[PDB]
Design an enzyme around this catalytic site. Structure first.
Site, PDB file in Angstrom:
ATOM      1  N   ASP A 140       0.806  -1.221   0.000  1.00 34.12           N
ATOM      2  CA  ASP A 140       0.000   0.000   0.000  1.00 34.12           C
ATOM      3  C   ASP A 140       0.840   1.273   0.000  1.00 34.12           C
ATOM      4  OD1 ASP A 140      -2.372   1.451  -0.021  1.00 34.12           O
ATOM      5  OD2 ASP A 140      -2.412   1.611   2.172  1.00 34.12           O
ATOM      6  N   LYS A 142       1.308   5.188  -0.700  1.00 31.58           N
ATOM      7  CA  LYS A 142       0.520   6.413  -0.794  1.00 31.58           C
ATOM      8  C   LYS A 142       1.256   7.578  -0.128  1.00 31.58           C
ATOM      9  CE  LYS A 142      -2.261   5.095   3.236  1.00 31.58           C
ATOM     10  NZ  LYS A 142      -1.869   3.661   3.257  1.00 31.58           N
ATOM     11  N   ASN A 145       2.345   8.035   3.460  1.00 34.51           N
ATOM     12  CA  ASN A 145       3.415   7.188   3.973  1.00 34.51           C
ATOM     13  C   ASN A 145       4.793   7.702   3.562  1.00 34.51           C
ATOM     14  OD1 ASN A 145       1.041   5.846   4.473  1.00 34.51           O
ATOM     15  ND2 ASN A 145       1.757   3.843   3.760  1.00 34.51           N
TER      16      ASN A 145
HETATM   17  N1  LIG Z   1       7.664   8.039  12.159  1.00 32.81           N
HETATM   18  C1  LIG Z   1       6.832   9.083  12.149  1.00 32.81           C
HETATM   19  N2  LIG Z   1       7.274  10.283  12.608  1.00 32.81           N
HETATM   20  C2  LIG Z   1       6.435  11.325  12.585  1.00 32.81           C
HETATM   21  N3  LIG Z   1       5.163  11.370  12.173  1.00 32.81           N
HETATM   22  C3  LIG Z   1       4.757  10.174  11.729  1.00 32.81           C
HETATM   23  C4  LIG Z   1       5.503   9.010  11.682  1.00 32.81           C
HETATM   24  N4  LIG Z   1       4.751   7.965  11.161  1.00 32.81           N
HETATM   25  C5  LIG Z   1       3.589   8.516  10.910  1.00 32.81           C
HETATM   26  N5  LIG Z   1       3.521   9.848  11.226  1.00 32.81           N
HETATM   27  C6  LIG Z   1       2.375  10.722  11.070  1.00 32.81           C
HETATM   28  O1  LIG Z   1       1.229   9.961  11.370  1.00 32.81           O
HETATM   29  C7  LIG Z   1       0.230  10.067  10.343  1.00 32.81           C
HETATM   30  C8  LIG Z   1      -0.219   8.679   9.960  1.00 32.81           C
HETATM   31  O2  LIG Z   1       0.958   7.867   9.813  1.00 32.81           O
HETATM   32  P1  LIG Z   1       0.899   6.420   9.165  1.00 32.81           P
HETATM   33  O3  LIG Z   1       2.261   5.839   9.244  1.00 32.81           O
HETATM   34  O4  LIG Z   1       0.338   6.431   7.745  1.00 32.81           O
HETATM   35  O5  LIG Z   1      -0.140   5.611  10.048  1.00 32.81           O
HETATM   36  P2  LIG Z   1      -0.590   4.198   9.568  1.00 32.81           P
HETATM   37  O6  LIG Z   1      -0.718   3.231  10.773  1.00 32.81           O
HETATM   38  O7  LIG Z   1       0.440   3.640   8.649  1.00 32.81           O
HETATM   39  N6  LIG Z   1      -2.093   4.318   8.823  1.00 32.81           N
HETATM   40  P3  LIG Z   1      -2.050   4.384   7.122  1.00 32.81           P
HETATM   41  O8  LIG Z   1      -1.502   5.791   6.643  1.00 32.81           O
HETATM   42  O9  LIG Z   1      -3.512   4.191   6.572  1.00 32.81           O
HETATM   43  O10 LIG Z   1      -1.201   3.291   6.559  1.00 32.81           O
HETATM   44  C9  LIG Z   1       0.815  10.891   9.197  1.00 32.81           C
HETATM   45  O11 LIG Z   1       0.008  12.036   8.957  1.00 32.81           O
HETATM   46  C10 LIG Z   1       2.228  11.289   9.656  1.00 32.81           C
HETATM   47  O12 LIG Z   1       2.397  12.703   9.683  1.00 32.81           O
END
Ligand SMILES: Nc1ncnc2c1ncn2[C@@H]1O[C@H](COP(=O)(O)OP(=O)(O)NP(=O)(O)O)[C@@H](O)[C@H]1O
Ligand SMILES: Nc1ncnc2c1ncn2[C@@H]1O[C@H](COP(=O)(O)OP(=O)(O)NP(=O)(O)O)[C@@H](O)[C@H]1O
Ligand SMILES: [Zn+2]
Length: 291
Positions: A140, A142, A145
């Protein structure tokens, strides 16, 4: 054989086992479809006071073809520091990226060049291929990420993990990845592959260079019918090399698509002519924008 390796425990080399009480909650970094990502501070230990990003799941596994949480490390991929299981929950402790996502940084510019996008796409390419060499599909891909570190170098938030939410409500309705960046064969339930990652990569390139998505409809089925059948004109304001790369990435049939054999045919593309790849991998190429 596609092998599912469950993630139950991980402690980075030279550190002690972690538990949720060793982490202080500071803020919400954001929210995605697998739940919110929070900002936590290590309270005790050699890295006490240092900031980390925390993900809370029910479980997460990793599908690999043919220790692995150490091999997945990459200059342009987030590092897994800790991982543990309490009360039916799996905590993941990762790097805290201070730059935010890329699209947000591009929208802070009145304009940008093909070169600026080329940088990010290059580093991204390195990351993706590195995952593929381990036998890992990012499933996935996008913009949400794709984040930046404090300097401006690409950092992905995941590495092809098959995750599971803790929210029973949402997770019971959870459906795979993001449709806008789906490959035609993934849409056709033929199953994910390496080449699908490069299709999604092409959609990212298109979205970055045009500011618009190549395929999007009123709903899921329309967007899918578009990905499979709709027409797509080539933006005439693009360079010949960009048009070439987009034309070669956008192939509805894999193994007819670029990168299905190796990324070396992506690295050699005329679009990436002035790119020193080893300096790129060594983060020795100066990023276009500071976060
Ligand atoms: N390592 C990180 N450091 C800082 N901000 C982060 C980090 N990982 C994620 N974020 C923030 O968190 C939000 C969502 O992160 P994400 O990693 O996509 O969550 P997820 O569990 O993977 N859900 P998804 O986006 O649907 O796959 C984003 O808007 C980023 O700004
Ligand atoms: N590492 C891999 N190599 C090759 N094919 C893979 C790999 N990982 C997954 N697949 C394929 O992708 C499919 C996994 O998706 P499946 O579990 O059927 O539903 P799904 O919801 O789309 N998967 P997911 O996105 O992780 O929730 C399988 O049918 C496999 O053929
Ligand atoms: Zn899937």
């Amino acid at each position: 054989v596609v092998k599912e390796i469950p993630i139950t425990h991980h402690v980075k080399e030279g550190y002690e086992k972690a538990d949720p009480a060793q982490f202080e909650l500071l803020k919400v970094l954001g929210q995605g479809s697998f739940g919110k990502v929070f900002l936590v501070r290590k309270k005790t230990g050699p890295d006490a006071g240092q900031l980390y990003a925390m993900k809370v799941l029910k479980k997460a596994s990793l599908k690999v073809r043919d220790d692995i949480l150490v091999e997945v490390n990459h200059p342009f991929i987030v590092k897994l520091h800790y991982a543990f299981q309490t009360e039916g929950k799996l905590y993941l402790i990762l790097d805290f990226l201070r730059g935010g996502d890329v699209f947000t940084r591009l929208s802070k510019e009145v304009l940008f060049t093909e070169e600026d996008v080329k940088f990010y796409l290059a580093e991204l390419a390195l990351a993706l291929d590195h995952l593929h060499q381990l036998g890992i599909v990012y499933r996935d891909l996008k913009p949400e990420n794709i984040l930046l570190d404090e300097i401006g170098h690409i950092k992905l938030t995941d590495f092809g993990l098959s995750k599971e939410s803790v929210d029973q409500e949402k997770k019971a309705y959870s459906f795979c990845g993001t449709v806008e960046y789906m490959a035609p064969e993934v849409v056709n339930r033929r199953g994910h592959s390496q080449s699908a990652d490069w299709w999604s990569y092409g959609v990212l390139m298109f979205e970055m260079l045009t500011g618009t998505l190549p395929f999007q409809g009123k709903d899921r089925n329309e967007t899918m019918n578009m990905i499979l059948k709709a027409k797509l004109g080539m933006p005439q304001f693009l360079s010949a090399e960009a048009q070439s790369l987009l034309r070669m990435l956008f192939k509805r049939n894999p193994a007819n698509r670029l990168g299905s054999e190796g990324v070396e045919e992506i690295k050699r593309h005329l679009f990436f002519a002035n790119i020193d790849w080893d300096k790129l991998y060594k983060r020795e190429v100066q990023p276009p924008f500071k976060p």
